[PDB]
């Protein structure tokens, strides 16, 4: 029989799958239409592509969950496909951090941005952000096996120090660095924007608060549960409780993937006009 968290997690993945696929497809079409003349568009283009690729692999995990943890795919598939949906989240996180840094660097020092800004710099920054996720993804590639009892997962046999190190680095970088960058950049941007009567507006506060709050609330449970799972020995009832809640904890992260294009659709200028243009 099933359990209480599993049903809620399953329903959330269905709704997030449909909404995310639709929104990501629409957004990627619209932004690919106008990716040649606008520098801002190519920022969100990569984010939409990564989000779509993350959401596209959901139904396979859906059918691996509904069948009571059954894996009728093969050893080769589990070594790639589950580890292919992990890069498409760190890529999005790093892209958000890069966009925040770009906005801060536009508001401060604008004369330098009037003379030495181009699409090449944006493409290089996007490429660096994409590449930085590969370094974090490689340990997932290198340490995954399959057990025929069929299950498949990470097996750090005799390995403890490397597991601790990779978990610590993953957590500290991929959560503390982008969050701190977001907070500092947005606080400074709000202060300088509200320091002059010519540039003051109320939409900036709403957008900033929405983005930061959504990120924090929707990404805290994943990290806090994952670090405890990594640190704690499997032979413990708390580990069993964490494994019970793991499906729901993972279920609460893709909602950020759902939210990300909604802000662009709603807080954008003339989205309907751009849609009719293409």
């Amino acid at each position: 029989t099933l359990r209480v968290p599993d049903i809620l997690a399953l329903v959330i993945f269905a709704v997030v799958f449909l909404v995310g696929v639709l929104g990501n497809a629409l957004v990627v079409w619209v932004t690919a239409f106008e990716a040649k003349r606008t520098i801002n568009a190519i920022w969100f283009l990569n984010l939409a592509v990564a989000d779509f690729l993350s959401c596209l692999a959901l139904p396979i995990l859906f059918t691996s969950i509904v069948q009571h943890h059954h894996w009728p795919f093969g050893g080769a598939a589990c070594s790639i496909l589950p580890s292919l949906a992990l890069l498409n989240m760190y890529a999005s996180i790093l892209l958000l951090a890069t966009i925040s840094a770009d906005r801060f660097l536009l508001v401060f020092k604008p004369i330098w941005c009037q003379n030495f800004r181009g699409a090449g710099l944006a493409w290089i920054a996007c490429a660096v952000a994409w590449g930085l996720a590969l370094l974090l993804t490689i340990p997932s590639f290198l340490y995954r096996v399959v057990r025929e009892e069929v299950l498949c997962g990470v097996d750090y046999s005799h390995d403890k120090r490397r597991e601790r190190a990779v978990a610590i680095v993953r957590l500290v970088l991929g959560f503390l660095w982008p969050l701190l960058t977001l907070t500092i950049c947005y606080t400074f941007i709000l202060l300088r924007t509200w320091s002059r009567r010519a540039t003051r507006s109320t939409k900036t506060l709403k957008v900033v608060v929405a983005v930061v709050a959504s990120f924090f609330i929707f990404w805290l449970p994943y990290q806090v549960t994952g670090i405890m799972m990594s640190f704690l020995e499997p032979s413990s009832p708390t580990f069993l409780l964490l494994k019970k809640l793991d499906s729901l904890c993972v279920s609460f992260a893709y909602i950020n993937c759902c939210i990300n294009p909604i802000i662009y659709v709603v807080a954008g200028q003339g989205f309907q006009g751009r849609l009719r243009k293409s």
Binding site: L151, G226, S230, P234, K243
Partner: peptide
């Protein structure tokens, strides 16, 4: 061994 993510 840890079934599912992690």
């Amino acid at each position: 061994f840890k079934p599912x993510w992690x």
